[PDB]
Write a protein that binds this DNA or RNA. Structure first.
Ligand SMILES: [Zn+2]
Ligand SMILES: [Zn+2]
Ligand SMILES: [Zn+2]
Length: 87
DNA sequence: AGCGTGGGAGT
DNA sequence: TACTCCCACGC
């Protein structure tokens, strides 16, 4: 992992330069990505994308359990729900 | 429950 | 560099 973070007291290292640059927004507070509906800004474009569903109500992730109609905005919410049904 | 926001990864 | 994804932790 040659891409080391030189910020004060940070010991993180990464194998990819883009992982380091993304990480460094934690230290600087930079939030490049802005929601066009509510104007909130975010550190990461993928988190802007899932945030925008709070406004649209879209829930593309459907439970696969027979006779369950529950749906979710994000994949990990569905993971948690499937775990709940039986594990 | 719903969602902010990291790391690691694939493309 | 760009993008999103899964997985994860946390509140
Ligand atoms: Zn750092
Ligand atoms: Zn918004
Ligand atoms: Zn279900």
């Amino acid at each position: 992992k040659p891409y080391q973070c030189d910020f004060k007291d940070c010991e993180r290292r990464f194998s990819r330069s883009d992982h380091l640059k993304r990480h460094q927004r934690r230290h600087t507070g930079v939030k490049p990505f802005q929601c066009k509906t509510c104007q909130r800004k975010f550190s990461r474009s993928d988190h802007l994308k899932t945030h925008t569903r709070t406004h649209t109500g879209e829930k593309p992730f459907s439970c696969r359990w027979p006779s369950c109609q529950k749906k979710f905005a994000r994949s990990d919410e569905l993971v948690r729900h499937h775990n709940m049904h039986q594990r």
